[PDB]
């Protein structure tokens, strides 16, 4: 965000953010702990305390239900566009 | 509830049943158990597991059960569900494959509906004409010559179907037989008396008489058969 | 109720649930078991973690019929609700042949009620193993019902906690002709190898069947055949 | 929250988090520094974080209600040419369970179908059905019910 | 470990470890040889809480009886950081009704606002192993 | 403390032999935060427990834990409230249905028994969970005299000189595990107040007679009652000047 | 985790979360306030209207689950009254049986363990309801139950179930209730829940009050109108 | 009672377990039936012939009455239960009736029974195909087919098991008129088909023909044998 | 899986009842037009093999002598939806000596959609839905009546609705084709000419069902020869 | 997520989301409107087609003589509810020779549709329900949810869009009580006119209005019978 930052208009691709972008969770252990915290660095740079810039996000997912409610949100991801199969 | 139910009755996407076949595994690893058909008789030879020297002898037989005054059988896969089995099977009795078609009619039973697991047990049916039966965890029973059911049962089958001559065969060359397989199949190079159970079923004075081979009976068997494989080396 | 099976076929074709059961057995307090040849002995380490447990409240050697005694390694709450069965299921004999219930008769109807719960919906199997002593036709028994529902004929066993090498001390120090009295000698002793801190009259339960029947010897008693062992 | 394993863990996190937890409340009472803090999961939060030496104050954010999602909509509807007939009290009545994020985004998507229409003013069915694209329900042919 | 108890002996130099989760540390860091006593500073009781509360109100402004014996037995669970939050939040109550003095009500609501804010604190019960 | 599937959500057993959903249950008799200690006299047994009314709007005379099972045994229960309410109106019916059909009052350890034959069958079926709650029954039998027995979520039980179980279990254990070892058949006061000193010593209140209830049963008069403040107040003045 | 999504899974620290979340539903409702005076207990619901188009009566969180005992909920209103019926059928079946009046000890006693009974397996759900059931008689006197959603019941002189519920406490504690009566805590249940409603939050609440004592005869009904609005303009008087 | 929902509509619209059934006959053996003239003639693939397995006891050929007869490809022990019931309900419907089953009767039965097992609690769906050839009361001959899913259509001629499409492919091409002119060449027909798929050859093909007014009769392994060689020896002649 | 049968979508559907409402477009064409002359149905039979008998692919059923119906999706599925309604009716005319009105059967066979589920149900209680779509048509008091059920228990009357793998295209064209003053033979005819456009084979008078409910007369499956006839129109 | 897959799993915010989801299914259905004045009761529902060849699904169903309901969501859990609701009607009538009382039957179904909501395996009745009725007390508009919570409602709308319906029966609330029955009848055709998108009306083929009075029955008016009412109404701004 900060190399997208450098630009007038920029657009970020997150292919696949069900990698990262996965519900957070405490199952006694370090389970995802990591992963949670870099979903949770994507989420704070999409809507914090700092304005975003002129950056307009895209996300594609086979798995929203594994989607952390915050990066669920609008602010972060305002539109969602469902690929249904077609008709 | 439908969190913790295993579904064992339910068909694989490959189309399997996949708790039949894990059953079916279980019969693997159990005792050998041997059945050979003969003209005037019909043996079930079982390998015994309980070999423990601190085991007491007081059944008249570890994986023979006598079902009725006609017909006997032999267990190999899990010994409690066995126990329920040949119980059913004394209840129900009768002709021989009607007896195992009423067994393998529950046996099914298990496997389609109830969401319980099925039996793991795999049986062999002898009685009286003469006629050998297997039954597996499926409820799928044949009719047989010559079978063996549990550890190395393919190598066991293999080996009777190279020397078992159909038609000609009496009990003694059964007997010998099963001896003879018997030997390949355990891994002990002598085969002792105390680590293997037979019993015969014949028709003496128009009665079926079901007996179970004393030990000094069968190590006639296993010396008999030790000296005859001693005769093929004085070839080589 | 739950209607499905909780006990299923590993893909190695083994009833794991029944072997965590078995594990719950080896982590039970030891219980040895005896044949001799006038009798049986069954005898447990009755170890309390504290004085403030009244010892001779529960009873881990409990009579089943005049004859019949168990003793079991395990869960203790698991073992009474199959000697409530065996008491139920000896006398369900009894009524019907007005006839003591055989020995070999009463383990295969218990071990039947242990397979139930391997296979049975919504249900764990118990985890204890039964050891049963009798006396029938004027030959002692002793058998073993695991916690998958077979049941084994044993001439001296142990089970529980360090039950492997208690089965061994058993194999080198049994002899069909032992007589009771010193069938509760190995009996004592084959406790004594696992057994930690010293053995009283009150921290070791033991039972023995013979002609007169079964009876659970009193702490007395135990402290006489104790004695000889120092 | 910190956990015990014998494998692996997060200890350097909980390092980190160890010391801001002796900056919070520690050894040197700091008076001085007024510290904010903001969690979506307060379950997961370690006890020692949430202390009332630390964190004296835990305020839950509740989810707006009828009156405050009004409000919302209102907020961020003044530098927008909106017709002088939006029922702010309807739209509210329309976002059962919709955060702050979501009443923003109903203005938001509001202009878009206006735009998407060419008008210059927003008017109360451009709220309407910015609602429906701001509930994002999935496409379903429930037209056969009632 | 090797300096608290090692090859050469610690003479004159005593050790104190403070944590609130002692089931994480190493067995040989709570070996007796190394951590000699392990003192267990556990939550305050009745008559604790009563004297941590009368530790943090005692320079507070107050007229009227305050009975202390009611927040103590709402302030079961209460660490002293609560005792003193709730002398904080009466306080805080008392500049929200612009008064220079709390009453005992005040004191009533800030142990039962602070006993609400507890309920977001997971286990704390951890001992050593 | 491995775990294989649903061994730590339902009743089965785990890789080494264990239920965790047993285990479980018991740290639910921690959660109501209170402590009972029940001691064994030579001719009396006493149950005592703290009893905490947290504000003045509770009506006192009902935050009881002793419960009157039958007019010859009673119990206290410690754990989830809804729970051993569960269990005392269980025994009760037990110990009527037993009077009724075998002619004669119920032993405590028969009682017990069959409380810990029932909550063993929720160690057994994954349909039900173990009641969080544990009942320390006392009563005087009419030849074995006085008897406590406490009654586990998993269906364990045993007899008791001295037993406790709450939160501070193990603590008193140990303060009456001390006692037992001097080997003195108590009196009535005698085993009062052991069994209040024992809650006094591990909680260190210094009890009112307001914050614990004593339940005894004597052989003299083998009926339990609950002992009034007054009479809770005459052991701890008693208690204090010695 | 999956240590929350069945009534019979404890967790591994002993609580059953389906219970406590079955708890939260109830601290997401409207406050409910009952004070067991002298001579009774008197019921007071701050009633929310959702809407302007529902009628005066509609939503009804005071029951009469039998002539002399009521019933005042917080929570869910289907399960609330689910319950409610439970307890006109436990007092039903207990007079075609002993042939009186319920103890309301009994009563609060009777269905606290069908209320528990749901929260032990999983094929039910715990009642996501806590309600408070008060009765007077010349015999057993006022008396004042409330029953949570785990099945605990304790007896109170003033109880306060709802989201300000604490509130509400901190108030009832000012009353001198053991010695007022009836007429007088009336007006004082109108204060306290006007003055534990939230104006700037969820509004246009309506005051719900009943009453069974000594100037009921034993029998419990809805305060009369003349009495409310007596309360209420001294309620609002109270607001400044 | 395992009262449990095993088989459901996936997203799509599909019935998995039907189509698992379904997969399970096509691990079976090839059974081939053919509907002739006067003459119904049902060949089924045996599986890995062994000299020690009573040929008695394993025979996919089984009759349901008199004048109907099955075969079937799948799951041996399902199809055994099929075959019972099936029996059971020919000898209900000839004591209300009095009149022997028509094949498209037993053939809804078993259809219906077969689909009951795809909607019912605990059931799972029979993973056998059905061949039922038989003839009615007025001598026409009748065959009819069943999946698991329940769902019965008369063939000419048909064929399920593993090789299936196979034998089916070559059975669209060689039925026809004079192919079925009389019942030595509908016997070649089936056994032509099964040589499609069968690799060794006689010895793994069971053959049994039921003619009008005739009980049905399994054909040895002699009569096979020559009717083979016949097969082989018009070969040479077409060369 | 985790889920039930009876449990609802976020969005208020039914998951069982959706599913199944997606086997219908798998299954084969149909279209059923009401006229004042009568009502039709037509379905394409969809045979996949030369050998198979096109006369045992049964489509169109004798609900009654006055009511037939046409069923396309889970062939299997409808039998027992259809035997009842052959039984519903016998059961109105046993009891009330007439004929059930066609609303009044389709009413009752949709209450049998939804009567599944997994726990707490009749042991003869079924599991998943009928993934089966019914065309009721007949001829009642309100004179010829067209009906369409859907796994959902769904039915409303239709002037002239297309069910199956082309459901969509036929309606289509079935609203370009149909006006509410038509004759039956024009129904017979334009009902055809959409199904040979959207059938995979080539149309003729073995691979479709013709059925039809006249006022007065019975319902009448057409035969081969009666096919023919209006086959060599278009 | 995991609390949303059945009936009996609470979330830890205190919700039930099957229940929750099944209010949705009523937000599905067509708009329906019911109101109510001193003497009278009227439903007024918008019925949906799914193609221009197909009837409009009917709406309005009778329950009783004195007692109607108009149903928004599953058309099949609908006619469940209402058999359950014509059963007991009729079975009051068969003891008590009387009327079953409105408020009465309400709380039937509201206690019948809370028992799914509760066990293992069952779901919420996914159909909204508007009961309009008259008995000694008078007339009274209910509305059923889902989640077997029932209000006793003086005007109500249920359905989809149905809340602009809703802002105006709260804005001419006040002249429901005094005003005729033919007013009452177009204040609920103008209430349901809100929830029509612009380019639609409302006509004959998607209007069914049904009335219960002190001294009429509960009548269904349909297309022909609906051409009374809707003449009057002008035409909206």
């Not at chain 3, 049963?132 to 004027?138: A, D, F, M, Q």
């Not at chain 9, 055809?192 to 069902?209: F, G, H, P, R, S």
């Not at chain 10, 177009?186 to 219960?212: C, M, W, Y």
């Amino acid at each position: 965000f900060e190399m997208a930052r450098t630009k007038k208009a920029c657009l970020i691709f997150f292919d696949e953010i069900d990698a990262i972008g996965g519900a957070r969770f405490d199952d006694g252990a370090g389970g995802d702990n990591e992963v949670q915290r870099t979903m949770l660095e994507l989420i704070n740079q999409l809507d914090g305390f700092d304005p975003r810039g002129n950056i307009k996000v895209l996300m594609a997912t086979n798995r929203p239900d594994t989607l952390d409610p915050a990066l669920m949100r609008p602010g972060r991801l305002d539109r969602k566009i469902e690929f249904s199969l077609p008709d | 509830s439908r969190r913790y139910d295993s579904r064992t009755t339910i068909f694989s996407p490959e189309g399997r049943l996949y708790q039949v076949e894990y059953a079916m595994e279980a019969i693997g690893h159990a005792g050998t158990c041997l059945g050979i058909l003969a003209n005037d008789g019909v043996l079930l030879a079982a390998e015994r597991r309980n070999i423990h020297k601190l085991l007491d002898e007081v059944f008249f037989s570890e994986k023979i059960y006598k079902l009725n005054e006609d017909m006997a059988c032999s267990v190999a896969g899990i010994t409690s569900d066995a126990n329920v089995l040949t119980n059913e099977l004394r209840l129900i009795a009768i002709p021989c494959e009607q007896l195992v078609t009423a067994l393998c009619d529950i046996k099914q039973a298990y496997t389609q509906f109830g969401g319980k697991r099925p039996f793991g047990v795999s049986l062999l049916y002898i009685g009286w004409g003469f006629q050998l039966y297997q039954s597996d965890p499926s409820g799928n029973y044949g009719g047989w010559k010559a079978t063996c059911i549990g550890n190395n049962s393919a190598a066991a089958v293999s080996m009777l179907k190279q020397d078992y001559k159909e038609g000609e065969m009496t009990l003694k060359s059964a007997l010998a037989l099963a001896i003879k397989v018997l030997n390949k199949t355990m891994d002990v190079s002598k085969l002792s008396a105390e680590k293997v159970e037979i019993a015969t079923l014949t028709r003496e004075n128009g009665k079926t008489v079901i007996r179970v081979l004393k030990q000094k009976e069968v190590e006639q068997l296993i010396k008999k058969h030790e000296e005859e494989e001693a005769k093929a080396e004085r070839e080589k | 109720g739950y209607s499905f099976s909780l006990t299923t076929f590993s893909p190695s074709g083994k009833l794991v649930q029944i072997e965590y059961a078995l594990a719950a057995v080896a982590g039970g307090a030891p219980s040895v078991g005896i044949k001799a040849a006038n009798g049986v002995v069954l005898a447990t380490e009755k170890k309390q973690k504290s004085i403030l447990y009244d010892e001779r409240s529960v009873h881990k050697v409990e009579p089943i019929t005049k004859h019949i005694g168990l003793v079991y390694s395990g869960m203790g709450p698991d073992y009474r609700v199959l000697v409530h069965r065996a008491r139920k299921l000896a006398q369900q004999y009894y009524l019907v042949y007005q006839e003591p219930i055989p020995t070999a008769q009463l383990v295969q109807r218990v071990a039947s009620v242990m397979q139930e719960y391997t296979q049975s919906g919504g249900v764990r199997p118990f985890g204890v193993s039964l050891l049963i002593c009798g006396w029938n036709e004027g030959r002692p028994y002793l058998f073993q019902s695991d916690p998958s529902g077979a049941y084994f004929a044993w001439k001296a066993t142990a089970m529980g906690k360090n039950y492997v090498n208690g089965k061994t001390f058993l194999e080198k120090r049994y002899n069909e002709d032992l007589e009771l009295e010193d069938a509760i000698h190995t009996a004592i002793l084959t406790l004594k190898e696992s057994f930690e801190g010293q053995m009283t009259e009150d921290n070791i339960e033991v039972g023995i069947c013979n002609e007169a029947g079964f009876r659970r010897l009193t702490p007395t008693e135990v402290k006489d055949y104790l004695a000889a062992i120092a | 929250k910190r956990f015990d394993s014998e494998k692996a863990g997060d200890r350097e996190v909980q390092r980190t988090m160890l010391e801001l937890l002796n900056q919070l409340d520690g050894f040197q009472p700091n008076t001085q520094v007024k510290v904010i803090a903001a969690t979506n999961r307060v379950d997961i939060l370690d006890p020692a974080l949430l202390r009332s030496g630390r964190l004296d104050r835990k305020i839950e954010f509740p989810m707006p209600n009828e009156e405050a999602r009004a409000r919302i909509m209102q907020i961020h509807s003044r530098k927008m040419n909106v017709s002088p007939d939006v029922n702010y009290e309807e739209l509210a009545r329309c976002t059962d369970d919709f955060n702050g994020a979501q009443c923003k985004a109903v203005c938001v998507e509001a202009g878009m179908i206006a735009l998407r229409r060419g008008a210059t003013e927003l008017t109360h069915e451009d709220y309407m059905e910015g609602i429906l694209e701001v509930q994002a329900k999935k496409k379903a042919n429930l037209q056969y019910y009632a | 470990l090797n300096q608290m108890d090692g090859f050469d002996t610690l003479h004159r130099v005593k050790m104190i470890m403070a944590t609130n989760r002692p089931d994480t540390l190493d067995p040989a860091l709570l070996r007796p040889g190394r951590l000699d006593r392990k003192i267990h500073i556990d939550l305050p009781n009745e008559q604790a809480r009563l004297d941590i509360l009368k530790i943090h109100a005692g320079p507070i402004t107050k007229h009227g009886e305050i009975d202390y014996e009611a927040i103590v037995k709402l302030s079961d669970g209460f660490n002293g950081a609560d005792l003193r939050n709730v002398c904080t939040e009466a306080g805080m109550f008392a500049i929200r009704a612009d008064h220079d003095f709390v009453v005992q009500e005040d004191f009533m609501k800030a142990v039962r606002k602070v006993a609400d804010s507890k309920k977001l604190e997971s286990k704390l019960d951890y001992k050593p192993v | 403390g491995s775990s294989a599937g649903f061994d730590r959500h339902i009743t089965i057993f785990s890789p080494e032999g264990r239920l965790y959903q047993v285990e479980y249950a018991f740290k639910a008799i921690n959660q109501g935060g209170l402590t009972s200690v029940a001691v064994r006299g030579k001719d009396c047994a006493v149950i005592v427990t703290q009893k905490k009314v947290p504000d003045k709007l509770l009506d006192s005379s009902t935050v009881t834990h002793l419960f009157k099972i039958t007019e010859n045994i009673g119990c206290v229960m410690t754990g989830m409230t809804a729970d051993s309410r569960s269990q005392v109106q269980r025994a009760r019916y037990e110990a009527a249905n037993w009077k009724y059909k075998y002619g004669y009052e119920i032993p405590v350890d028969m009682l017990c028994k069959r409380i810990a034959d029932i909550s063993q069958v929720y160690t057994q079926n994954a349909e039900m969970r173990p009641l969080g709650c544990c009942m320390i029954l006392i009563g005087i039998d009419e030849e074995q005299g006085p008897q406590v027995y406490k009654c586990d979520p998993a269906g364990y039980y045993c007899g008791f000189k001295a037993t406790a179980a709450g939160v501070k279990q193990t603590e008193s254990t140990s303060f009456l595990e001390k006692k037992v070892k001097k080997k003195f058949d108590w009196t009535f006061e005698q085993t009062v107040e052991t069994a209040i000193t024992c809650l006094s010593t591990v909680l260190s209140i210094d009890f009112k007679p307001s914050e614990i209830e004593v339940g005894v049963v004597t052989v003299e008069n083998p009926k339990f009652r609950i002992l009034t403040e007054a009479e809770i107040d005459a052991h701890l003045v008693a208690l204090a000047e010695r | 985790t999956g240590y929350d999504l069945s009534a019979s899974t404890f967790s591994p620290d002993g609580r059953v979360f389906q219970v406590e979340y079955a708890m939260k539903a109830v601290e997401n409702s409207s406050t409910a306030i009952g004070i067991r005076c002298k001579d009774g207990v008197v019921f007071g619901v701050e009633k929310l209207v959702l809407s302007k188009l529902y009628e005066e009566g509609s939503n009804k969180r005071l029951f009469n689950v039998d002539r002399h005992v009521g019933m005042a909920v917080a929570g869910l209103l289907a399960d609330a009254r689910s319950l409610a019926d439970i307890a006109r059928e436990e007092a039903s079946n207990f007079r075609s049986n002993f042939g009186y009046n319920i103890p309301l000890k009994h009563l609060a006693d009777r269905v606290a363990m069908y209320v528990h009974a749901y929260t032990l397996y999983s094929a039910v759900r715990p009642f996501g309801c806590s309600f408070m059931l008060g009765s007077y008689s010349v015999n057993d006197g006022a008396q004042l139950y409330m029953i949570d959603p785990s099945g605990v019941s304790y007896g109170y002189w003033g109880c306060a179930i709802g989201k300000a519920r604490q509130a509400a406490k901190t108030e009832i504690e000012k009353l001198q209730m053991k010695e007022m009566t009836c007429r007088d805590i009336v007006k004082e249940v109108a204060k306290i829940i006007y003055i534990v409603h939230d104006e700037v939050k969820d509004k246009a609440f309506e005051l719900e009050l009943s009453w069974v004592g000594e100037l009921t005869n034993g029998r419990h009904e809805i305060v009369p109108k003349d009495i409310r609005e007596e309360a209420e303009k001294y309620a609002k008087e109270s607001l400044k | 009672s395992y009262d449990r929902a095993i088989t459901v509509f996936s997203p799509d619209g599909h019935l998995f377990q039907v189509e698992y059934a379904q997969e399970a006959v096509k691990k079976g053996s090839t059974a081939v039936g053919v509907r002739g003239r006067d003459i119904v003639v049902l060949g089924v693939e045996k599986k890995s012939v062994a000299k020690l397995q009573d040929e008695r006891t394993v025979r996919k050929i089984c009759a349901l009455d008199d004048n109907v007869c099955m075969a079937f490809a799948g799951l041996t022990a399902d199809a055994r239960i099929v075959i019972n019931r099936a029996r059971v309900e020919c000898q209900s419907h000839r004591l209300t009736v009095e009149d022997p089953v028509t094949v498209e009767y037993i053939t809804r039965y078993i259809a219906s029974l077969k689909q009951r097992y795809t909607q019912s609690n605990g059931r799972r769906p029979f993973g056998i195909s059905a061949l039922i050839v038989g003839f009615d009361f007025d001598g026409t001959p009748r065959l009819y087919q069943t999946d698991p899913s329940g769902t019965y259509h008369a063939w000419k001629a048909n064929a399920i098991g593993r090789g299936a499409k196979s034998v089916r492919e070559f059975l669209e091409k060689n039925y026809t008129d004079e192919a079925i002119e009389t019942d030595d060449l509908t016997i070649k027909l089936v056994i032509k088909a099964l040589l499609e798929v069968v690799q060794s050859g006689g010895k793994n093909i069971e053959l049994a023909v039921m003619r009008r007014d005739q009980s049905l009769k399994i054909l040895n392994p002699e009569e096979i044998e020559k009717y083979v060689a016949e097969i082989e020896k018009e070969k040479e002649e077409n060369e | 899986y985790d889920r039930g049968v009876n449990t609802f979508s976020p969005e208020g559907r039914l998951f069982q009842v959706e599913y199944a409402i997606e086997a219908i477009k798998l299954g084969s064409t149909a279209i059923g037009i009401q006229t004042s002359e009568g009502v039709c149905l037509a379905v394409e039979k969809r045979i996949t093999s030369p050998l198979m008998e096109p006369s045992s692919i049964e489509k169109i059923v004798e609900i009654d002598a006055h009511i037939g119906c046409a069923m396309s999706g889970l062939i299997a599925d409808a039998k027992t939806l259809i035997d009842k309604a052959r039984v519903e009716t016998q059961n109105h005319w046993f009891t009330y000596n007439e004929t059930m009105t066609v609303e009044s059967v389709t009413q009752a066979v949709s209450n049998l959609a939804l009567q599944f589920g997994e726990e707490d149900a009749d042991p003869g209680a079924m599991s998943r839905p009928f993934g089966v779509a019914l065309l009721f048509g007949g001829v009642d008091e309100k004179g010829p009546q067209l009906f369409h059920m859907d796994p959902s228990g769904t039915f409303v009357q239709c002037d002239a609705r297309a069910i199956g793998s082309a459901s969509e295209g036929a309606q289509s064209s079935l609203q370009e084709v149909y006006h509410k003053s038509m004759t039956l033979k024009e129904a017979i005819k334009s009902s055809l000419i959409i199904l040979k456009q959207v059938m995979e084979e080539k149309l003729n008078a073995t691979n479709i069902e013709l059925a039809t409910v006249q006022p007065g007369q019975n319902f009448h499956m057409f035969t081969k020869e009666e096919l023919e006839e209006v086959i060599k129109d278009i | 997520n995991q609390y949303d897959n059945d009936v009996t799993v609470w979330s830890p915010q205190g919700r039930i989301h099957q229940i929750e989801y099944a209010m949705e299914a009523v937000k599905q259905g067509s708009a329906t409107v019911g109101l109510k004045s001193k003497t009278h009761a009227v439903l007024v529902a918008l019925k949906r087609a799914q193609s221009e060849l197909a009837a409009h699904q009917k709406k309005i169903l009778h329950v009783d003589n004195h007692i109607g309901i108009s149903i928004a969501g599953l058309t099949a859990d609908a006619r469940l509810l209402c058999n359950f609701m014509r059963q007991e009607c009729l079975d009051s009538r068969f003891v008590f020779d009387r009327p079953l009382p409105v408020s009465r039957l309400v709380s039937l179904i509201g206690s019948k549709t809370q028992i799914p909501t509760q066990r293992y395996g069952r779901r919420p009745y996914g159909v909204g329900l508007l009961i309009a009725g008259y008995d000694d007390m008078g007339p009274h508009i209910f509305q059923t949810c889902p989640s077997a919570n029932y209000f006793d409602c003086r005007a109500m709308s249920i359905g989809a869009r149905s809340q602009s319906a809703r802002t105006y029966l709260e804005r001419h609330m006040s002249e429901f009580m005094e005003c005729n029955l033919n007013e009452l009848v177009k204040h609920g055709l103008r209430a349901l006119r809100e929830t029509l998108p612009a380019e639609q009306d409302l006509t004959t083929k998607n209007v069914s209005i049904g009335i219960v009075g002190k001294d009429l029955e509960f009548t269904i008016y349909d297309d022909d019978d609906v051409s009374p009412f809707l003449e009057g109404l002008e035409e909206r701004p």
